[PDB]
């Protein structure tokens, strides 16, 4: 087998700061688009997380602030790459 890996389990992607609410994320919220807030787009790097019940999330920070949507506690663990960036074209 080959040597390494030499890379780290993250990936670079385009991200956005809402100037009206002062948060940074991968996209504006549906409420931020509907109320039509101002935002600045730029590139960043993202971090992947898992909860012990099997629930999942992602942040631009080293840990998310939010409680679990499935069991209601706070037990997020940092996890690695999803083994693919995306599938075929889908949705609208």
User: What is the binding site for Zn ion (CB under 5 A)?
Assistant: 18, 20-21, 32, 37, 51, 53, 55, 68, 70-71
26 neighbors 16 (Cβ within 8 angstroms): yes
47 neighbors 64 (Cβ within 8 angstroms): no
CB of 77 to Zn ion, least distance (A): 11
CB nearer to Zn ion: pick between 60 and 68? 68
CB of 8 to Zn ion, least distance (A): 26
47 neighbors 40 (Cβ within 8 angstroms): no
CB of 82 to Zn ion, least distance (A): 19
Q: Which residues contact 78 (CB under 8 A, 6 or more apart)?
A: 47, 48, 49, 62, 63
CB nearer to Zn ion: pick between 11 and 41? 41
CB nearer to Zn ion: pick between 14 and 19? 19
Collapsed DSSP state (helix, strand, coil) of residue 35:
coil
């Amino acid at each position: 087998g080959p040597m390494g890996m030499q890379s780290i389990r993250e990936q670079s992607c385009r991200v956005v700061t809402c100037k009206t609410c002062k948060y940074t994320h991968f996209k504006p919220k549906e409420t931020c688009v509907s109320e039509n807030h101002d935002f600045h787009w730029h590139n960043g790097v993202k971090r992947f997380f898992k909860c012990p019940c099997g629930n999942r999330t992602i942040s631009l920070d080293r840990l998310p602030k939010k409680h679990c949507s499935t069991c209601g506690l706070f037990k997020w663990e940092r996890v690695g790459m999803l083994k693919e960036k995306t599938g075929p074209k889908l949705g609208g």
